[PDB]
Curated annotation (Swiss-Prot), chains A, B:
Homomultimer. Makes the hexons and eleven out of twelve pentons. Interacts with triplex proteins 1/TRX1 and 2/TRX2; adjacent capsomers are linked together in groups of three by triplexes, heterotrimeric complexes composed of one molecule of TRX1 and two molecules of TRX2. Interacts with scaffold protein; this interaction allows efficient MCP transport to the host nucleus. Interacts with capsid vertex component 2/CVC2. Interacts with the small capsomere-interacting protein/SCP. It is found in: Virion; Host nucleus. This is Major capsid protein. Coiled coil: none annotated. The gene is MCP. Belongs to the herpesviridae major capsid protein family. Self-assembles to form an icosahedral capsid with a T=16 symmetry, about 200 nm in diameter, and consisting of 150 hexons and 12 pentons (total of 162 capsomers). Hexons form the edges and faces of the capsid and are each composed of six MCP molecules. In contrast, one penton is found at each of the 12 vertices. Eleven of the pentons are MCP pentamers, while the last vertex is occupied by the portal complex.
Length: 49, 49
């Protein structure tokens, strides 16, 4: 889901709820997801901290 | 490990221990490790000195 929504359109997904954000930060981090989107996902949690 | 972590993300590994920094600076200065990530270790050692 995230990979396609990021490649086709210049946006990141699942910004709707906090639990999905915490998990996508946590369990994800494999090569499978693009790092360009992934650092943008991490920065949200960093700002919350 | 260092080549994979630098290419997976624009960050360098083994930054924790000074011994590992001295090893990455001493050996591994040939083409085996990526040039850009090695320049960081050179800059760290140079700043220390």
């Amino acid at each position: 889901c995230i990979n396609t929504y990021w490649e086709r359109s210049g946006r990141l997904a699942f910004v709707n709820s906090f639990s999905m954000i915490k998990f996508i930060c946590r369990h994800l981090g494999n090569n499978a997801i693009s790092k360009e989107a992934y650092s943008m996902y991490r920065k949200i949690y960093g700002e919350l901290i």
